[PDB]
Ligand binder design. Structure first.
Ligand SMILES: Cc1cn2cc(C(F)(F)F)cc2c(=O)[nH]1
Length: 228
């Protein structure tokens, strides 16, 4: 009788959505934990709340790829207090790496406390608008995740990609249309942001919206193909 089944996405499981807890015994944001013991074996999972984590909403919504997998190197822009980052850290595991870039010092203190227990998280308390200021800290990554909410932030993500994202690496970008242009339709916003990505050789491969968890919020996944 298996209680927690592997999801299609490696490192993700269904119990609903959970990740394998890199730090057994501890919750990050009050989430439920499920510890299963059999003989001498023991594994713990943490519930992943799609109402707080856009990535979890996208997974439940059926996104085909997330590119966040065991051993992956991740640049996470807008890491906030580390809710979603903690689950990314679970997925990439001890051989992966998560750079958690966050502008707010208050949020940064939460990230630093989270990363004390998680070897694979590097807090980077900096303004993502100016990646030249922290470029010396960031090894080239496999995937960039970003939460975009202003009409200049796809371009910020792209500037980070041009500095840090490997050729043929991937991006997962959440778009809050209301925050980009509240006078535009959500479709106008999502089309315009996809266009901005394409201009930067960030080529979308799929996109979805996040109902019932969020209103007028899309996640775009794609591939980075810079010219020579
Ligand atoms: C909550 C949050 C979101 N965010 C988004 C960006 C980028 F412009 F890179 F997209 C940067 C940040 C950040 O420092 N904090």
């Amino acid at each position: 009788n298996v209680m927690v089944e592997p999801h299609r996405h490696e490192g993700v499981f269904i119990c609903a959505l959970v990740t394998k807890n890199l730090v057994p015994g501890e919750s990050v944001y009050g989430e439920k934990r499920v510890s299963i013991s059999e003989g001498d074996d023991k594994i713990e999972y943490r519930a992943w709340n799609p109402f707080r984590s856009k990535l979890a909403a996208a997974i439940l919504g059926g996104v085909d790829q997330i590119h966040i997998k065991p051993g992956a190197k991740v640049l996470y822009l807008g890491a906030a207090s580390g809710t979603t980052v903690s689950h990314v850290s679970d997925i990439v595991g001890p051989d992966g790496l998560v750079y958690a870039v966050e502008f707010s010092h208050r949020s940064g203190r939460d990230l630093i406390n989270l990363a004390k227990k998680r070897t694979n998280i590097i807090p980077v308390i900096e303004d993502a608008r100016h990646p030249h200021k922290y470029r010396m800290l960031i090894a080239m990554v496999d995937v960039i995740f970003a939460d975009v909410a202003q009409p200049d932030q796809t371009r910020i993500v792209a500037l980070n990609a041009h500095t840090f994202l490997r050729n043929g690496g991937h991006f997962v970008i959440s778009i809050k249309a209301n925050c980009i242009d509240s006078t535009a339709s959500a479709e106008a916003v999502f089309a315009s942001e996809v266009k901005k990505m394409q201009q930067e050789n960030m080529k979308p491969q799929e996109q979805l919206t996040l109902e019932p968890y969020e209103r007028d919020h899309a996640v775009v996944v794609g591939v980075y193909r810079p010219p020579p």
